[PDB]
Amino acid sequence: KPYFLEAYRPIRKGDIFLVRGGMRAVEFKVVETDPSPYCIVAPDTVIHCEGEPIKREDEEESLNEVGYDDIGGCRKQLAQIKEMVELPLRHPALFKAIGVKPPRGILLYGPPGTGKTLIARAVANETGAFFFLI
């Protein structure tokens, strides 16, 4: 109710709109909309208190995963990495269309607790590339 209030948030059936409170981030999927396809939420809509844990479908990647929005203070090097390794993953057929040598090894050095593995996992999640840890 606080979230929908003063908002008139548009919403389509199946959306995963997320709410935050009680220092926890819970996302509620709208399963059914009486009109279709989408609807505005109005304060005059009776509200429906069910609270059942329907398990998430396998195919979607949970919102639990990290992204570029979960890191701060390393914008310059983050942009460097993004521009360095954006083409070989989103455009490999290109790299087979041209004769050029891409990088095949990267080193990151800094004091511990600076967000290195976090950066690697964020980059992996944000391009769909398979991630392996050693």
Add this chain to the structure above:
Amino acid sequence: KPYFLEAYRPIRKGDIFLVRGGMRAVEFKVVETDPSPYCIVAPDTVIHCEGEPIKREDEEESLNEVGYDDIGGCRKQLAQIKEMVELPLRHPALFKAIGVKPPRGILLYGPPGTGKTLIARAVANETGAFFFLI
């Protein structure tokens, strides 16, 4: 006799009131009280000489285990450890009820013969958590 003397100690059947002397601490359990449930002790009560070793019940934890009363001179560090590890050990469900990171590793540095394992055992006995030694 000297302990009940000048005392009128309140006493209920089954209590483990402890007596100390002869450079040893022995506790005598009252198994029978002629009136019930509790009573005061009086100098005019004849006394009974039995002195038989009935073995202690399994479920109760003996008085041999160390408590905070056995450690003095380290009040600050003991208070720090208590305030640090009271919640996770005695309120596990809460930490699942909120998103926060508890500590799962502690180091204690000091010269030998200062009572570090003593403190660990005292805390373990005072919170009822299982204790393992390596």
